[PDB]
């Protein structure tokens, strides 16, 4: 089983009348809910307009975010994985061998990309062995620096968020 916290949605931006039960039946959609609360106020139960879901598996997590926007009791609400929010990453030890459609053929499995920047040296324009990769959406970058590993034109590459 995969690690619970990284099966976790916190759900931001809910409508105050969002309950966990309408929670719950929404993001069912997408897969089996192990978990689903609404944050209230331990003294009013007047919710805090956030929550958090756990999915069964990351697949789940992956289709729940894929069918963003959601819409839950008539807002649009903000699905984050839970922590371990940005677009670009950083993405190192790709040498000097490294081009953009390994970069690309890359992470573009892991959602739109935007730009590829591959750095060069200012005074030689070799390349120094890094790049950065925008994404069109923060979740790309969320999958992306959660893994442990990634494999890029066969080098062992060390990638992080950029801001």
């Given at each position: 089983k995969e690690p619970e916290q990284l099966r976790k949605l916190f759900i931001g931006?809910?409508?105050?009348?969002?309950?966990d039960e309408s929670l719950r039946s929404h993001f069912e959609q997408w897969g089996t809910l192990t978990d689903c609360v609404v944050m209230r106020d331990?003294?009013?139960?007047?919710?805090?307009g956030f929550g958090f879901v756990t999915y069964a598996t990351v697949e789940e997590v992956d289709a729940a975010m894929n069918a963003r926007p959601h819409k839950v009791d008539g807002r649009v609400v903000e699905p984050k994985r839970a922590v371990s929010t940005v677009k670009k990453i950083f993405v190192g030890g790709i040498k000097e061998d490294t081009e953009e459609h390994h970069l690309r053929d890359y992470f573009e499995q892991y959602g739109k990309i935007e730009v590829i920047e591959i750095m060069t040296d200012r005074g030689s324009g070799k390349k120094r062995g890094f790049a950065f990769v925008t994404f069109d959406d923060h979740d790309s970058v969320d999958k992306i620096v959660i893994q442990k590993y990634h494999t890029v034109n066969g080098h062992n590459c060390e990638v992080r968020k950029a801001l």
């Amino acid at each position: 089983k995969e690690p619970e916290q990284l099966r976790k949605l916190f759900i931001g931006g809910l409508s105050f009348e969002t309950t966990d039960e309408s929670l719950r039946s929404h993001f069912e959609q997408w897969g089996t809910l192990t978990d689903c609360v609404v944050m209230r106020d331990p003294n009013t139960k007047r919710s805090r307009g956030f929550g958090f879901v756990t999915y069964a598996t990351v697949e789940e997590v992956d289709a729940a975010m894929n069918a963003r926007p959601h819409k839950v009791d008539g807002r649009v609400v903000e699905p984050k994985r839970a922590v371990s929010t940005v677009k670009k990453i950083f993405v190192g030890g790709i040498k000097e061998d490294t081009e953009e459609h390994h970069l690309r053929d890359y992470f573009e499995q892991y959602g739109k990309i935007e730009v590829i920047e591959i750095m060069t040296d200012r005074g030689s324009g070799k390349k120094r062995g890094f790049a950065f990769v925008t994404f069109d959406d923060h979740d790309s970058v969320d999958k992306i620096v959660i893994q442990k590993y990634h494999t890029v034109n066969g080098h062992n590459c060390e990638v992080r968020k950029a801001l």
